[PDB]
């Protein structure tokens, strides 16, 4: 599956100094994030229940499963050896996609 590229390896914009990356996670689609001094990630919306009451997001480092519900739209995701990221999502029912605010300030390269 081919992923839609968001960000650049030579740029720090959107990942440093209280800034975030806005992503649109399509069902049966993939999104790839790139940043200076940060590991390359793969964001994918795996499962969506009828509602949409439950959104399954899988984060894979170049996976870890995160659950997004209307009650709990924001979650801190731990990626062992790579630090953390925050998925501040906007669930607006079964539209086939999920809009997320990704905060990659606490992310780091393993080495």
């Amino acid at each position, epitope marked *: 599956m081919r992923c839609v590229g968001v960000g650049n390896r030579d740029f720090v914009e959107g990942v440093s100094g209280g800034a975030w990356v806005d992503l649109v996670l399509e069902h049966g689609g993939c999104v790839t994030t790139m940043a200076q001094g940060k590991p390359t990630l793969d964001f994918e919306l795996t499962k969506t229940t009828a509602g949409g009451l439950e959104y399954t997001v899988v984060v894979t480092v170049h996976g*870890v*499963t*995160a*659950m*997004i*519900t209307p009650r*709990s739209p924001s*979650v*801190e*995701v*731990k990626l*062992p*050896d790579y*630090g*953390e990221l*925050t998925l501040d999502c906007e669930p607006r029912s079964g539209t086939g996609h999920l809009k997320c605010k990704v905060r990659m*300030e*606490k992310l780091r390269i*393993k080495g």
Partner: antibody
Amino acid sequence: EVQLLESGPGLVKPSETLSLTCTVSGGSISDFYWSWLRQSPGKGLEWIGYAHSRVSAYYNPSLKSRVTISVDTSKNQISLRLSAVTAADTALYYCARQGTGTTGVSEDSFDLWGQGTKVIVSL
Amino acid sequence: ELQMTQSPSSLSASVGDRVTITCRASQDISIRLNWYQQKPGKAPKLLIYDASTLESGVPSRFSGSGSGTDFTLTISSLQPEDFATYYCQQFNSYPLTFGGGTKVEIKR
């Protein structure tokens, strides 16, 4: 104000499953990462693993095949399940909050701890 | 797993003395190290995080230093309540590992 109350049997027979409960008081269980640790006078302080209500759990590779840590939002409690138990699993078990960038004191530090539960594996 | 070595295992000291607890890592862990205090019958209590940052409520006598592999915990002037077992914990790589601990006993 968030408090951790530890529960479970003090004596477990060998080959059985070790079940312990950590109840959260005066706060929301959903917002934090919950960890389980153990201490013995020869193996020292050992990190078993962590669990989150909406994020997939991560365990120590030395216990991964036998350990399960679950977060129950409705019951407001965290459970620790250790199968195929032996005398080597006899330790003082602790339930703690694993800090993040916004929650706890700092990322991957244990600020809030349980009272501790003495678990003896014997027939 | 990432091995953490604490030296000495046992330390005999007097009240008012300057005590230094060492913690050595097998790999470079940057400043990703935390310090804990454990008294008999009680759970471990966090003192210092991020190698040098002091936790709120912890007295000024407790100090943290080091980067990479070599790390130190310093109690400038030892108080009667400070007699406990001190542990160092890394968080650079998983699984999260703790040191063997340093038991601070009263010299006589």
